[PDB]
Amino acid sequence: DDDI
Amino acid sequence: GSPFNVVPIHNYPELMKDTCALINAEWPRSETARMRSLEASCDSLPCSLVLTTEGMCRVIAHLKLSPINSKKKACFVESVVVDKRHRGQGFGKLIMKFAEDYCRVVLDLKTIYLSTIDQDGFYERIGYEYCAPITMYGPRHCELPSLQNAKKKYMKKVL
Ligand SMILES: *C(=O)CSCCNC(=O)CCNC(=O)[C@H](O)C(C)(C)COP(=O)(O)OP(=O)(O)OC[C@H]1O[C@@H](n2cnc3c(N)ncnc32)[C@H](O)[C@@H]1OP(=O)(O)O
Protein backbone atom coordinates (compact mmCIF):
# COMPACT_ATOMS: atom_id res chain seq x y z
CA ASP A 1 0.00 0.00 0.00
CA ASP A 2 0.91 3.67 -0.46
CA ASP A 3 3.74 4.43 1.95
CA ILE A 4 2.45 7.98 2.54
CA GLY B 1 20.86 -10.43 -23.19
CA SER B 2 18.41 -8.97 -20.68
CA PRO B 3 18.30 -5.14 -20.57
CA PHE B 4 16.39 -5.00 -17.27
CA ASN B 5 18.02 -3.66 -14.12
CA VAL B 6 16.77 -3.09 -10.56
CA VAL B 7 18.63 -0.21 -8.91
CA PRO B 8 18.39 1.86 -5.74
CA ILE B 9 16.87 5.25 -6.41
CA HIS B 10 19.51 7.16 -4.44
CA ASN B 11 22.12 6.21 -7.06
CA TYR B 12 19.84 7.28 -9.95
CA PRO B 13 18.50 10.78 -9.22
CA GLU B 14 17.79 11.04 -12.96
CA LEU B 15 14.94 8.54 -12.41
CA MET B 16 13.28 10.35 -9.50
CA LYS B 17 10.72 12.45 -11.39
CA ASP B 18 9.72 9.42 -13.48
CA THR B 19 9.31 7.37 -10.29
CA CYS B 20 7.17 10.12 -8.74
CA ALA B 21 4.98 10.11 -11.85
CA LEU B 22 4.69 6.32 -11.69
CA ILE B 23 3.51 6.23 -8.06
CA ASN B 24 1.29 9.30 -8.44
CA ALA B 25 -0.49 7.66 -11.38
CA GLU B 26 -1.81 5.05 -8.93
CA TRP B 27 -2.09 7.19 -5.76
CA PRO B 28 -2.26 10.89 -6.70
CA ARG B 29 -0.19 13.08 -4.39
CA SER B 30 2.02 16.11 -4.94
CA GLU B 31 5.33 15.55 -6.70
CA THR B 32 7.16 17.02 -3.70
CA ALA B 33 5.52 14.51 -1.34
CA ARG B 34 6.78 11.63 -3.48
CA MET B 35 10.22 13.23 -3.78
CA ARG B 36 10.51 13.40 0.02
CA SER B 37 9.90 9.65 0.23
CA LEU B 38 12.41 8.87 -2.52
CA GLU B 39 15.04 11.25 -1.12
CA ALA B 40 15.10 9.26 2.13
CA SER B 41 16.40 6.16 0.31
CA CYS B 42 19.78 4.90 1.52
CA ASP B 43 21.89 1.74 1.67
CA SER B 44 20.17 0.40 4.80
CA LEU B 45 16.52 1.27 5.42
CA PRO B 46 14.55 2.90 4.04
CA CYS B 47 15.40 2.02 0.44
CA SER B 48 13.47 2.57 -2.79
CA LEU B 49 14.16 0.12 -5.63
CA VAL B 50 13.14 0.89 -9.21
CA LEU B 51 13.12 -1.38 -12.24
CA THR B 52 14.72 0.35 -15.23
CA THR B 53 16.44 -0.67 -18.47
CA GLU B 54 19.57 -0.18 -20.52
CA GLY B 55 19.65 3.51 -21.42
CA MET B 56 17.57 4.38 -18.31
CA CYS B 57 14.87 6.09 -20.40
CA ARG B 58 11.98 4.96 -18.20
CA VAL B 59 10.90 3.39 -14.91
CA ILE B 60 8.89 0.18 -15.10
CA ALA B 61 8.29 -0.58 -11.41
CA HIS B 62 8.96 0.73 -7.90
CA LEU B 63 8.85 -0.50 -4.33
CA LYS B 64 9.98 0.91 -0.99
CA LEU B 65 11.61 -1.05 1.82
CA SER B 66 10.87 0.55 5.18
CA PRO B 67 12.14 -0.16 8.71
CA ILE B 68 9.88 -1.57 11.42
CA ASN B 69 10.40 0.03 14.83
CA SER B 70 9.82 -3.17 16.83
CA LYS B 71 11.39 -5.70 14.41
CA LYS B 72 15.11 -5.28 13.73
CA LYS B 73 15.24 -8.37 11.46
CA ALA B 74 12.21 -7.43 9.34
CA CYS B 75 11.11 -4.72 6.96
CA PHE B 76 7.90 -3.37 5.46
CA VAL B 77 7.57 -3.20 1.66
CA GLU B 78 5.33 -0.36 0.49
CA SER B 79 4.22 1.53 -2.62
CA VAL B 80 4.55 -1.49 -4.91
CA VAL B 81 3.50 -0.33 -8.38
CA VAL B 82 4.23 -1.44 -11.94
CA ASP B 83 3.74 0.91 -14.89
CA LYS B 84 0.21 0.29 -16.17
CA ARG B 85 1.15 -0.57 -19.75
CA HIS B 86 3.77 -3.00 -18.36
CA ARG B 87 1.45 -4.86 -15.98
CA GLY B 88 0.80 -8.57 -16.29
CA GLN B 89 4.23 -9.11 -17.85
CA GLY B 90 6.17 -10.50 -14.87
CA PHE B 91 7.70 -7.22 -13.68
CA GLY B 92 5.82 -7.24 -10.38
CA LYS B 93 7.16 -10.68 -9.53
CA LEU B 94 10.59 -9.59 -10.78
CA ILE B 95 11.00 -6.60 -8.47
CA MET B 96 9.43 -8.41 -5.51
CA LYS B 97 11.87 -11.32 -5.86
CA PHE B 98 14.78 -8.89 -6.27
CA ALA B 99 13.71 -7.07 -3.10
CA GLU B 100 13.35 -10.33 -1.18
CA ASP B 101 16.85 -11.44 -2.18
CA TYR B 102 18.18 -7.94 -1.45
CA CYS B 103 16.72 -7.98 2.07
CA ARG B 104 18.03 -11.48 2.80
CA VAL B 105 21.51 -11.26 1.28
CA VAL B 106 22.45 -7.57 1.58
CA LEU B 107 20.45 -6.40 4.61
CA ASP B 108 20.46 -9.78 6.44
CA LEU B 109 16.74 -9.60 7.19
CA LYS B 110 14.54 -12.59 8.01
CA THR B 111 10.99 -11.41 7.22
CA ILE B 112 9.21 -9.01 4.87
CA TYR B 113 5.82 -7.56 5.80
CA LEU B 114 3.30 -5.73 3.64
CA SER B 115 -0.31 -4.61 3.61
CA THR B 116 -2.71 -4.57 0.68
CA ILE B 117 -6.35 -3.68 0.20
CA ASP B 118 -7.24 -5.70 -2.91
CA GLN B 119 -4.09 -7.29 -4.40
CA ASP B 120 -3.52 -10.03 -1.81
CA GLY B 121 -4.08 -12.57 -4.60
CA PHE B 122 -0.89 -11.36 -6.27
CA TYR B 123 1.16 -11.71 -3.08
CA GLU B 124 -0.36 -15.09 -2.18
CA ARG B 125 0.69 -16.30 -5.63
CA ILE B 126 4.35 -15.36 -5.07
CA GLY B 127 4.55 -16.88 -1.60
CA TYR B 128 3.20 -14.43 0.99
CA GLU B 129 1.09 -15.58 3.93
CA TYR B 130 -1.76 -13.68 5.53
CA CYS B 131 -0.88 -12.53 9.04
CA ALA B 132 -2.12 -10.36 11.88
CA PRO B 133 -1.66 -6.59 11.49
CA ILE B 134 1.66 -5.02 12.47
CA THR B 135 2.77 -1.43 12.95
CA MET B 136 6.04 0.06 11.77
CA TYR B 137 5.98 2.87 14.36
CA GLY B 138 6.61 2.94 18.09
CA PRO B 139 3.90 3.12 20.74
CA ARG B 140 3.98 6.95 20.96
CA HIS B 141 1.91 7.19 17.80
CA CYS B 142 -1.24 8.96 16.61
CA GLU B 143 -2.12 9.62 12.97
CA LEU B 144 -5.19 10.99 11.23
CA PRO B 145 -7.86 8.25 11.15
CA SER B 146 -9.02 6.76 7.87
CA LEU B 147 -11.44 3.94 7.09
CA GLN B 148 -8.86 2.51 4.66
CA ASN B 149 -6.71 1.26 7.55
CA ALA B 150 -9.18 -1.45 8.60
CA LYS B 151 -9.49 -2.53 4.95
CA LYS B 152 -5.80 -3.43 4.75
CA LYS B 153 -4.85 -7.11 4.70
CA TYR B 154 -1.43 -7.70 6.22
CA MET B 155 0.85 -10.36 4.76
CA LYS B 156 4.36 -11.63 5.41
CA LYS B 157 7.02 -13.81 3.83
CA VAL B 158 9.73 -15.57 5.80
CA LEU B 159 12.76 -15.12 3.54
C1 LIG C 1 1.37 -1.63 -1.25
O2 LIG C 1 1.87 -0.76 -1.94
C3 LIG C 1 1.41 -3.08 -1.73
S4 LIG C 1 -0.15 -3.52 -2.45
C5 LIG C 1 -0.46 -2.44 -3.83
C6 LIG C 1 -0.17 -3.19 -5.12
N7 LIG C 1 0.05 -2.23 -6.19
C8 LIG C 1 -1.07 -1.74 -7.00
O9 LIG C 1 -2.20 -2.14 -6.78
C10 LIG C 1 -0.80 -0.72 -8.12
C11 LIG C 1 -1.44 -1.20 -9.46
N12 LIG C 1 -1.06 -2.55 -9.82
C13 LIG C 1 0.33 -2.96 -10.00
O14 LIG C 1 1.26 -2.16 -9.85
C15 LIG C 1 0.64 -4.39 -10.41
O16 LIG C 1 -0.44 -4.89 -11.14
C17 LIG C 1 0.90 -5.34 -9.22
C18 LIG C 1 2.12 -4.87 -8.38
C19 LIG C 1 -0.37 -5.45 -8.30
C20 LIG C 1 1.22 -6.72 -9.84
O21 LIG C 1 2.22 -6.49 -10.82
P22 LIG C 1 2.15 -7.30 -12.24
O23 LIG C 1 0.93 -6.87 -13.02
O24 LIG C 1 3.41 -7.01 -13.05
O25 LIG C 1 2.07 -8.85 -11.91
P26 LIG C 1 2.89 -10.04 -12.60
O27 LIG C 1 4.27 -10.08 -12.03
O28 LIG C 1 2.94 -9.86 -14.09
O29 LIG C 1 2.07 -11.38 -12.26
C30 LIG C 1 2.65 -12.45 -11.51
C31 LIG C 1 1.60 -13.52 -11.28
O32 LIG C 1 0.65 -13.11 -10.23
C33 LIG C 1 -0.69 -13.14 -10.87
N34 LIG C 1 -1.49 -12.12 -10.35
C35 LIG C 1 -1.30 -10.77 -10.48
N36 LIG C 1 -2.30 -10.15 -9.82
C37 LIG C 1 -3.11 -11.10 -9.28
C38 LIG C 1 -4.25 -11.02 -8.52
N39 LIG C 1 -4.78 -9.75 -8.18
N40 LIG C 1 -4.87 -12.14 -8.11
C41 LIG C 1 -4.35 -13.37 -8.45
N42 LIG C 1 -3.21 -13.44 -9.20
C43 LIG C 1 -2.60 -12.32 -9.62
C44 LIG C 1 -0.43 -12.96 -12.31
O45 LIG C 1 -1.50 -13.55 -13.09
C46 LIG C 1 0.78 -13.72 -12.50
O47 LIG C 1 0.37 -15.11 -12.57
P48 LIG C 1 1.39 -16.22 -13.12
O49 LIG C 1 0.76 -17.58 -12.95
O50 LIG C 1 1.65 -15.96 -14.59
O51 LIG C 1 2.69 -16.15 -12.35
**Which residues in chain B are contacts of A4 at CB distance < 8 A?**
29, 33-34, 37, 79
List residues of chain A with CB under 8 Å from any CB of chain B: 1-4
User: DSSP labels for B17-45?
Assistant: HHHHHHHHHHS---HHHHHHHHHT--SSS
Is B69 assigned a ligand-binding role in the annotation? Answer: yes
Q: Using a 6 Å cutoff on CB, does residue B122 contact ligand 1? A: yes
- Residue B114 CA, closest ligand 1 atom number: 3
Residue A3 has φ and ψ, to the nearest 5°, of: -65, -25
Query: Is B118 in contact with B80 (CB distance < 8 Å)?
Result: no
Q: To one decimal place, what's the resolution in Å?
A: 1.8
B56 is in an annotated binding site: no
Which residue range(s) make up the domain with B76? 1-159
Phi and psi at B158, nearest 5°, equal: -75, 120
Interhelix angle B16-26/B31-39, rounded to 10 degrees, is: 120
Nearest to residue B102, comparing CAs of B22, B45, B36, B40? B45
Quote the number of domains for chain B.
Answer: 1
Q: Which amino acid is at B38?
A: L
- Hey, is B151 helix, strand or coil? helix
Pocket test of ligand 1: the residue of B50, B97, B119 to mutate, having most ligand atoms within 8 Å of its CB, is B119
**Between A1, A3, A4, which is nearest B152 by CB?**
A1
| Ligand 1 contact via B112 beta carbon (within 6 Å) | no
* Cβ density class B30-66: b for 16+ within 10 Å, e for less: eeeebeebbebbeeebbbbbbbbeeeeeebbbbbbbb
Experimental method: X-ray
Is B29 annotated in a binding site? The answer is: yes
